[PDB]
């Protein structure tokens, strides 16, 4: 396990990806310059 003064619980382990979302927005403006967009937007 992980272990870090917290019940020694293992962070988001593996096999944790079933895919349950829609979205899917083809390349609009890619990522040329840093400074990601706030979590309010996330993607372009």
């Amino acid at each position: 396990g992980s272990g870090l003064s917290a019940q020694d619980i293992s962070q988001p382990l593996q096999n944790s990806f079933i895919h349950t979302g829609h979205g899917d927005s083809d390349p609009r403006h890619c990522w040329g310059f840093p400074d990601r967009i706030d979590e309010l937007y996330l993607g372009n």
Binding site: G1, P12, T20, D35, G43
Partner: protein, 184 residues
């Protein structure tokens, strides 16, 4: 058991999907949008007992352009991003984040993460910083400012060379998995 709430705020992934996403795929130098389909349901063993958390990602696409949870999250452990490349902006980031993260929430903790450190280490981008400074925020630097406000801790991570990823991101969720201890 104890659960967690993965919510990142800022101009960087830090505690976003980029961690597990890029860790598996999606590529960094490609595009950023499809991720809008967050709310991924997973089933694994989160230390204690078989269970998984729910990372609710906010976006502005067809999925949900009306959402807005990052407004004033009542979380206890926020996620502050940054980058080694800095042309004398360090003074701004500090005086721009500390008063921001606290503005929305009366004094809200955070965690420093490293990633670009892999490339910024180059003497090229550095030269761009040289225009105003040149001093690259070393993995130890972020830790200094991070502890300055008793945030949490700056761990190693890289979405290009793979400097752990889960390590730093593990420290972010850790604050939610259980009350961690500082280093003083």
């Amino acid at each position: 058991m104890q659960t967690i709430k993965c919510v990142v705020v800022g101009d960087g992934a830090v505690g976003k999907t980029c961690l597990l996403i890029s860790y598996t795929t999606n590529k960094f130098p490609s595009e950023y949008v499809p991720t809008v389909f967050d709310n991924y349901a997973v089933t694994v063993m989160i230390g204690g007992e078989p269970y998984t958390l729910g990372l609710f990602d906010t976006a502005g696409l067809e999925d949900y352009d009306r959402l807005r949870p990052l407004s004033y999250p009542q979380t206890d452990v926020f996620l502050v991003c940054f980058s080694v490349v800095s042309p004398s902006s360090f003074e701004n980031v500090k005086e721009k984040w500390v008063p921001e993260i606290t503005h929305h929430c009366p004094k809200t903790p955070f965690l420093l993460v490293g990633t670009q450190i892999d490339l910024r280490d180059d003497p090229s981008t550095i030269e761009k910083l040289a225009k105003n400074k040149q001093k690259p925020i070393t993995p130890e630097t972020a830790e200094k400012l991070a502890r300055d406000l008793k945030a949490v801790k700056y761990v190693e991570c890289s979405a290009l060379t793979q400097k752990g990823l889960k390590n730093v991101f593990d420290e972010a969720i850790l604050a939610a998995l259980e009350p961690p201890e500082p280093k003083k």
